[PDB]
Design an enzyme around this catalytic site. Structure first.
Site: not given
Ligand SMILES: Nc1nc2c(ncn2[C@@H]2O[C@H](COP(=O)(O)OP(=O)(O)OP(=O)(O)O)[C@@H](O)[C@H]2O)c(=O)[nH]1
Ligand SMILES: [Mg+2]
Ligand SMILES: CC(=O)O[C@H]1C(=O)[C@@]2(C)[C@H]([C@H](OC(=O)c3ccccc3)[C@]3(O)C[C@H](OC(=O)[C@H](O)[C@@H](NC(=O)c4ccccc4)c4ccccc4)C(C)=C1C3(C)C)[C@]1(OC(C)=O)CO[C@@H]1C[C@@H]2O
Ligand SMILES: Nc1nc2c(ncn2[C@@H]2O[C@H](COP(=O)(O)OP(=O)(O)O)[C@@H](O)[C@H]2O)c(=O)[nH]1
Lengths: 427, 440
Positions: B207, B180, B11, B141, B229, B255, B72, B145-146
């Site tokens: 974050n 989160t 994500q 991230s 970002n 390096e 997703e 899970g992704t």
């Molecule tokens: N700072 C920041 N963190 C993000 C952003 N998008 C996703 N994340 C990360 O996504 C986490 C939320 O959990 P999820 O919604 O499951 O996203 P994920 O951990 O990447 O898992 P997936 O959604 O399956 O990819 C947060 O703890 C963030 O670290 C973003 O746009 N900015």
């Molecule tokens: Mg996602």
């Protein structure tokens, strides 16, 4: 996992199910006839979640209305919303089961079965990959309790890897309108905790308290009670049909909210609650929506959340909201009310920020938690069931169909084992 | 060297990855439609600008080498409807029909292996077009899970096929305070078990620390993911700034793994962006050499929720950009070492790798950052990083002692004993992180 099939069982499920589609068609801009009104890039690309693209540009839902009362279906098709539903999913019967669980389970409910499961297999072949099944039933009736629990065992048997998100209706321990309600509610939990992966506890007692305190509605009818329920059902599947920052899937709300397979009863909620006329007197802010979700007067359950302890909480912030204000106001409640959260899990509440906004409101938020205070509702039903089972009252209405005294003892024993597990994790 | 392949999964990978290419197109003057308007020659968009990250094709078009793999469809389909839809090739976007949610078991064994056979074919065809491939670039991230399951599965299959490649990684570690996700610590221990034995350098970012760098420094009242970002994209652009341009001291990606990672293990550097100034206070700052250098070691400008003053410094790496003086760099670092707070080890007599860059960077229009004349990037390795790993282990021991969320992993295809081996490998890394750092 992008298509969701909604099934309404019983008279109570048809009144809430048919009203739920009225709110869905208003968000995407769908007329009550068939032709779409307004389509956008964030709505047309996700029309396959609850609607199917037929011919001549007609969108019809996948609702399956099955009941045992002909007066319920005839009261919906003759209105101004029955034109959207296909005249091939309404499957009813001649005789009515009333408030008996044994009739709609193997006596009167066994007449259909093959007819109800026939339309389910047709919708599974037309879609790409199924996701979940939204079954709206009730605990206390004859069709929603007797046949509502039997349909869950048939869908999971053919689809074991599919989610079963049911919106059950729990009885109210404050002046009920039925007598054989504990007999229909105890037998429903025995078939609910063995197939459904997640459920929601909703009672009618907490509905009249909200309309007479925050909404300030003089004598609310049955139509106003469906608005508070449809807003929660539509607030769960928001990230599936609309993009956002922190999206959430139906399986995500099960891993982060169901620690044990025997513990899956959630506590629904919604926010805010602005009365008619006091729009300028209420400020829609993040700290204002947070206090309305952790309040006892805004919960749709008859149990006191202050007595129990929270375990897994799920929040859904919609509208023009910022992630900075969500994470800040969330920690202030956990730090101040540290006695309500158990230290066994440091992450009791997660964040799910949305990007879209409902038609009208600017900031919306819902509250979904699985606290240990849900065992209070199971104790009130168990006391009323054990008090009437000793005198063997209203027993010949069930044993004359095919029931046995051994099945009532197994259903009552499972009610005591569920409450005994909530006390272990609470400590 | 030459071309660098960038991979964005999860994500946060698909969101932060879009901000990285947005800054690259502004520095090189690349049109978002896929043209060469406003640039022509010069190192700011010529032969030295078209190489690396981007790729030169035909008809005067230039496409990047990004591979967006997300489990997703609600994220990949959103990028297609945006203005940046003509840059990357449409075949590079591989979506899915089953959301893995935030479970590590499904995105590594079931759903993770459904698209594993298709993502390896895209990397193989892309590496053949690179006349001298240098390394790779990942964006994980830790918390889902992704970005955790598919990211660790793709890194294992890629390290066995290649090997001697600078496989960079910009993972996002969970915040030690506000979290989160509920099963977030479960996806953190299982990710570091395979990341340490495959990846060569994993830049960690928090974050929660970025929220402090925008409310107190940038004075942003309502910061969102659109601003987080942009700060991370400037860090990735500062590392490869010496390779995509010219300068007095050219620093290669090979390096960063020698002067910072002497041991086969321990490769978790920090990041502290110094040029953090809002537009309201742009006329009340000198932007001198010693002023920006002293702001690197400040905890207020660090992108990681950690206290470097409580620990000791092992190996630092500064990246000076813009128009700086070579003599002023050696004098500003010497003043910091004589403060008796850095606490340098006994074996390393210096440990301050400098990197002078001549090309001044820029800022995205969707931020409160102005066009500065110089930028400094801090990539150090402190001994206080084990404190953040200890807080994650404490949250994992409480959930494992009573078996909280266990059936969600065993029912998919993961042995119960895997959590014990992953915890032992994480505990052995933290134990050796303090023993070696105490007498290094
Ligand atoms: N700072 C920041 N963190 C993000 C952003 N998008 C996703 N994340 C990360 O996504 C986490 C939320 O959990 P999820 O919604 O499951 O996203 P994920 O951990 O990447 O898992 P997936 O959604 O399956 O990819 C947060 O703890 C963030 O670290 C973003 O746009 N900015
Ligand atoms: Mg996602
Ligand atoms: C002049 C004006 O702005 O009026 C508003 C209004 O005053 C308020 C108080 C509305 C009003 O809502 C209620 O009073 C209410 C009644 C029963 C159950 C729940 C709410 C409103 O009736 C509701 C109505 O909501 C909508 O139009 C939404 O699209 C909403 N629609 C329905 O619920 C709906 C109602 C009848 C028939 C069909 C649909 C919706 C929300 C989510 C998802 C889909 C649709 C709105 C904004 C208003 C009025 C009209 C006064 C509020 O509710 C909603 C859902 O917006 C109550 O608090 C909000 C804040 C609004 O400002
Ligand atoms: N909240 C709510 N509850 C309802 C509504 N309609 C019916 N009910 C509940 O449903 C119960 C009656 O169920 P019933 O219709 O007899 O079940 P059936 O015979 O199987 O169809 C009552 O106790 C009500 O509390 C409604 O519109 N809203």
């Amino acid at each position: 996992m992008r298509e969701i099939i909604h099934i309404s069982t019983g008279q109570c499920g048809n009144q809430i199910g048919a009203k739920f589609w009225e709110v869905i068609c208003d968000e995407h801009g769908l007329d009550f006839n068939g032709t779409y009104h307004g389509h956008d890039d964030i709505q047309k690309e996700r029309l396959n979640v609850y609607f199917n693209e037929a011919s001549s540009g007609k969108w019809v839902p996948r609702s399956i209305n099955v009941d045992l009362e002909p007066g319920t279906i005839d009261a919906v098709r003759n209105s101004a919303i029955g034109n959207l539903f296909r005249p091939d999913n309404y499957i009813f019967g001649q005789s009515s089961a009333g408030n008996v669980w044994a009739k709609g389970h193997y006596t009167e409910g066994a007449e259909l079965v093959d007819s109800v499961m026939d339309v389910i297999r047709r919708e599974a072949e037309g879609c790409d990959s199924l996701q979940g099944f939204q079954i709206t039933h009730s605990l206390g009736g004859g069709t929603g309790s007797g046949m509502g629990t039997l349909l869950i065992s048939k869908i999971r048997e053919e689809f074991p890897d599919r989610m079963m998100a049911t919106f059950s209706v729990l009885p109210s321990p404050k002046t009920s309108d039925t007598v054989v309600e504990p007999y229909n509610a105890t037998l429903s939990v025995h078939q609910l905790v063995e197939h459904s992966d997640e459920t929601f506890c909703i009672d009618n007692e907490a509905l009249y308290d909200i309309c007479q305190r925050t909404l300030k509605l003089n004598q609310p009818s049955y139509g106003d009670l469906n608005h508070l329920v449809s807003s929660v059902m539509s607030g769960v599947t928001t990230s599936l049909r609309y993009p956002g920052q922190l999206n959430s899937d139906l399986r995500k709300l099960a891993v982060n909210l169901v620690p044990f397979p025997r513990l899956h009863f959630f506590m629904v909620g919604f926010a805010p609650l602005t009365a008619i006329g006091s729009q300028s007197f209420r400020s829609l802010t993040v700290p204002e929506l947070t206090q309305q979700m952790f309040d006892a007067k805004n919960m749709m359950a008859a149990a006191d959340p202050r007595n129990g302890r929270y375990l897994t909480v799920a929040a859904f912030f919609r509208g023009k909201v910022s992630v900075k204000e969500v994470e800040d106001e969330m920690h202030k409640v956990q730090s101040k009310n540290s006695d309500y959260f158990v230290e066994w899990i440091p992450n009791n509440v997660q964040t799910a920020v949305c990007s879209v906004a409902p038609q009208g409101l600017d900031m919306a938020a819902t509250f979904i938690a699985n606290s240990t205070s849900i065992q209070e509702l199971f104790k009130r039903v168990g006391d009323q069931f054990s008090a009437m089972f000793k005198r063997k009252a209203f027993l010949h209405w069930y044993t004359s169909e095919g029931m046995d005294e051994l099945e009532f003892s197994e259903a009552e024993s499972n009610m005591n084992d569920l409450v005994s597990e909530y006390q272990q994790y609470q400590e | 060297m030459r071309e660098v392949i960038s991979i964005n999964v999860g994500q946060a990978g698909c969101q932060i990855g879009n901000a990285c290419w947005e800054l690259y197109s502004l520095e090189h003057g690349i049109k978002p439609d896929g043209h060469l308007e406003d640039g022509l020659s010069k190192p700011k968009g010529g032969e030295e600008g078209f190489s690396t990250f981007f790729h030169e094709t035909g008809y005067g078009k230039f496409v990047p080498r990004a591979i967006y793999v997300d489990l997703e469809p609600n994220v990949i389909d959103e990028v297609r409807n945006g203005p940046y839809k003509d840059l990357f090739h449409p075949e590079q976007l591989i979506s899915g029909k089953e959301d893995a949610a935030n479970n590590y078991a499904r995105g590594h064994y079931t759903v993770g292996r459904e698209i594993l056979g298709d993502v390896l074919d895209r990397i193989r065809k892309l590496a053949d077009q690179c006349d001298g491939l240098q390394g790779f670039l990942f964006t994980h991230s830790l918390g889902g899970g992704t970005g955790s399951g598919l990211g660790s599965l793709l890194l294992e299959e890629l390290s066995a096929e290649y090997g001697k490649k600078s496989k960079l990684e910009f993972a996002v570690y969970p915040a030690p305070q506000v979290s989160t996700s509920v099963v977030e610590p479960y996806n953190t221990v299982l990710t570091t078990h395979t990341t340490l034995e495959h990846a060569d350098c994993t830049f960690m970012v928090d974050n929660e620390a970025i929220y402090d760098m925008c409310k107190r420094n940038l004075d942003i009242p309502r910061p969102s993911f659109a601003n987080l970002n942009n700060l991370i994209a400037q860090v990735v652009s500062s590392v490869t700034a010496s390779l995509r341009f010219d300068g007095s001291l050219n620093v290669d990606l090979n390096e960063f793994q020698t002067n910072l990672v002497p041991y086969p293990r321990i490769h978790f550097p920090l990041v502290s962006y110094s040029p953090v100034l809002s537009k309201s206070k742009a006329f009340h700052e000198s932007n001198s050499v010693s002023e920006i250098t002293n702001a690197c070691f400040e905890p207020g400008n660090q992108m990681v929720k950690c206290d470097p003053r409580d620990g000791k410094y092992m190996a630092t790496c500064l990246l000076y950009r813009g128009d700086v003086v070579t003599r002023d760099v050696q004098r500003a670092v010497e003043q910091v070492k004589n403060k008796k707070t850095v606490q340098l080890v006994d074996w390393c007599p210096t440990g301050f790798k400098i990197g002078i860059c001549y090309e001044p960077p820029t800022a995205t229009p969707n931020s409160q950052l102005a066009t500065v004349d110089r930028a400094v990037c801090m990539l150090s390795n402190t001994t206080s990083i084990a404190e953040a790993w200890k807080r994650i282990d404490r949250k994992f021991d409480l959930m494992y002692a009573k078996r909280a969320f266990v059936h969600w992993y065993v029912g998919e295809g993961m042995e119960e004993g895997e959590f014990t081996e992953a915890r032992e490998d994480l505990a052995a890394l933290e134990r050796d992180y303090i023993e070696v750092g105490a007498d290094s």
